[PDB]
Write an enzyme that holds these catalytic residues in place. Structure first.
Site, mmCIF file in Angstrom:
data_model
loop_
_atom_site.group_PDB
_atom_site.id
_atom_site.type_symbol
_atom_site.label_atom_id
_atom_site.label_comp_id
_atom_site.label_asym_id
_atom_site.label_seq_id
_atom_site.Cartn_x
_atom_site.Cartn_y
_atom_site.Cartn_z
ATOM 1 N N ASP A 140 0.833 -1.195 0.000
ATOM 2 C CA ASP A 140 0.000 0.000 0.000
ATOM 3 C C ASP A 140 0.873 1.253 0.000
ATOM 4 O OD1 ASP A 140 -2.406 1.348 -0.090
ATOM 5 O OD2 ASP A 140 -2.638 1.439 2.093
ATOM 6 N N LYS A 143 2.323 3.410 -5.906
ATOM 7 C CA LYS A 143 1.703 2.418 -6.767
ATOM 8 C C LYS A 143 2.631 1.944 -7.893
ATOM 9 C CE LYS A 143 -1.410 3.401 -3.923
ATOM 10 N NZ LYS A 143 -1.375 2.666 -2.620
ATOM 11 N N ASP A 168 -3.286 -3.142 -2.229
ATOM 12 C CA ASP A 168 -4.433 -2.243 -2.244
ATOM 13 C C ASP A 168 -4.362 -1.307 -3.442
ATOM 14 O OD1 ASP A 168 -6.812 -1.105 -1.415
ATOM 15 O OD2 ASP A 168 -5.820 0.348 -0.083
ATOM 16 N N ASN A 169 -5.515 -0.760 -3.818
ATOM 17 C CA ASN A 169 -5.617 0.284 -4.835
ATOM 18 C C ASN A 169 -5.192 -0.197 -6.222
ATOM 19 O OD1 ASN A 169 -4.360 2.469 -2.311
ATOM 20 N ND2 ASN A 169 -6.509 2.335 -2.952
ATOM 21 N N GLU A 198 -16.739 4.747 -1.224
ATOM 22 C CA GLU A 198 -18.000 5.491 -1.210
ATOM 23 C C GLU A 198 -17.775 6.987 -1.424
ATOM 24 O OE1 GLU A 198 -21.414 4.248 0.118
ATOM 25 O OE2 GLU A 198 -22.159 6.156 -0.689
HETATM 26 NA NA NA Z 1 -4.455 2.402 -0.004
#
Ligand code: NA
Ligand SMILES: COc1ccc([C@H](C)c2cc(-c3cn(C)nc3C)[nH]n2)cc1
Ligand code: NA
EC number: 2.1.1.6
Length: 219
Positions: A140, A143, A168-169, A198
């Site tokens: 995380d 990226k 993640d992501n 959200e």
């Molecule tokens: Na993240």
């Protein structure tokens, strides 16, 4: 002066309870969803993390990108006695916050915080931190580093058959080079865990990639 990360930590110390990791998670999620946006895995993805930790009960976990310590608290609270989390954080002030966060949570004895860049620290794990192989890696951090650090972990001998990578992501903002590689490679058995952001009103996801062992040479 004041920073968002100092504010998150202050909010936890005011409203959570010391030695109660769950209240710490709830304070951070409340803060980040009601008071001030921050880079945060959030409770929904956190549930997925919990389930992975519980399924594989890793004894040695490497986290890349601790930030304020949310994921470190999330994971370390589910670790057994004798289990270790090693977490890497490139920014010195965030590393400090993460330490205090874990101290407050009562989890400081389960975690080693390393303040540096992943590509510099990962090759020192075997020598300096007495690591053989990792049971789980949580990615995380930056990226564009997911793919090269995964390759680095492999070439350093830190992955064994059954090692779980959880990233993640991978959809938002996305790590398509990492996904193409792990999904395509016979060295990783991949599954994808969709989860809604959200606040951004967009679907994101985590990728789970289970190391299968190095590629076999041609016969
Ligand atoms: Na993240
Ligand atoms: C805007 O600048 C930043 C944005 C996000 C972060 C996250 C919290 C982060 C990333 C890393 C990191 C990066 N490498 C190459 N190795 C490690 C370890 N640690 N923590 C840090 C700085
Ligand atoms: Na694959």
């Amino acid at each position: 002066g004041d920073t968002k990360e100092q504010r998150i930590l202050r909010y936890v110390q005011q409203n959570a309870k010391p030695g109660d990791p769950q209240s710490v998670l709830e304070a951070i999620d409340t803060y980040c969803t009601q008071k001030e946006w921050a880079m945060n895995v959030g409770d929904a993805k956190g549930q997925i993390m919990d389930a992975v930790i519980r399924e594989y009960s890793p004894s040695l976990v490497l986290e890349l990108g601790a930030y304020c310590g949310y994921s470190a608290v999330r994971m370390a609270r589910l670790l057994q006695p004798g289990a270790r989390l090693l977490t890497m954080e490139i920014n010195p002030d965030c590393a400090a916050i993460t330490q205090q966060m874990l101290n407050f949570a009562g989890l400081q004895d389960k975690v080693t915080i390393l303040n540096g860049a992943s590509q510099d620290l990962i090759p020192q794990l075997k020598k300096k931190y007495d690591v053989d192989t990792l049971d789980m890696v949580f990615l995380d951090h930056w990226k564009d580093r997911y793919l090269p650090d995964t390759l680095l972990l492999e070439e350093c001998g830190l992955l064994r058959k059954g090692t779980v990578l959880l990233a993640d992501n991978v959809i938002v903002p996305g790590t398509p080079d990492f996904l193409a590689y792990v999904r395509g490679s016979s060295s990783f058995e991949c599954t994808h865990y969709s989860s809604y952001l959200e606040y951004m009103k967009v679907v994101d996801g985590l990728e789970k990639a289970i190391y299968q062992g190095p590629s076999s040479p041609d016969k």
